[PDB]
Design a protein around this ligand. Structure first.
Ligand code: NA
Length: 186
């Protein structure tokens, strides 16, 4: 049998995010684009390959709210990730959440759930988000600096790309913006 329980710091944070209430339709669609850009694969449908059980639960709620049929939810044994396959509508692909702080925030939330991780900050200050497309990467950094004064970097390693945050004051600002409350762990 295959376990869905990871006890990492990253999950503890992501479990707290599963519950944040949804917002406008457009805020929901921007988060979904987060998931799509961090972990989506078009070929309908979109197939989402998630490492986070919590992100995975959030995705299914995103799809419920949007009335989007989920085709399949398979857990791949280590003996992990979770493959969710989902219908979509093309208007989802083309929302631009970079110029409205609420849509951007919603979009950061999707990036981080689906492709983000963070080291336990007692040991080391490090938050990254898997995000491959350079246009999207550059727009997100601009909007982070712009709205939040957050200096985001780029990790480039072996045909992968991560958006990167080093500063704990920055990680804090970011985690508060996407909805984390129990970061009173400070
Ligand atoms: Na590190």
């Amino acid at each position: 049998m295959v376990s869905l329980l990871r006890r990492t710091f990253s999950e503890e944070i992501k479990e707290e995010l599963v519950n944040v209430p949804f917002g406008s339709r457009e805020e929901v669609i921007s988060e979904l684009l987060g998931f799509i850009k961090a972990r989506g694969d078009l070929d309908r449908h979109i197939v989402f390959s998630l490492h986070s059980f919590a992100a995975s639960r959030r995705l299914l709620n995103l799809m419920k709210y949007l009335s989007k049929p989920v085709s399949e939810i398979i857990v791949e044994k280590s003996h992990r990730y979770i493959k969710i396959t989902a219908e979509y509508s093309e208007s989802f692909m083309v929302i631009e959440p970079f110029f409205d702080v609420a849509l951007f925030v919603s979009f950061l939330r999707g990036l981080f759930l689906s492709g983000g991780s963070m080291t336990n900050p007692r040991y080391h200050y490090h938050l990254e988000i898997n995000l491959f497309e350079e246009e999207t990467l550059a727009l997100t950094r601009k909007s982070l600096k712009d709205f939040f004064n957050i200096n985001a970097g780029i990790i480039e390693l072996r045909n992968t790309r991560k958006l990167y945050i080093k500063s704990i004051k920055d990680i804090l600002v970011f985690l508060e913006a996407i909805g984390v409350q129990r970061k009173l762990e400070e």
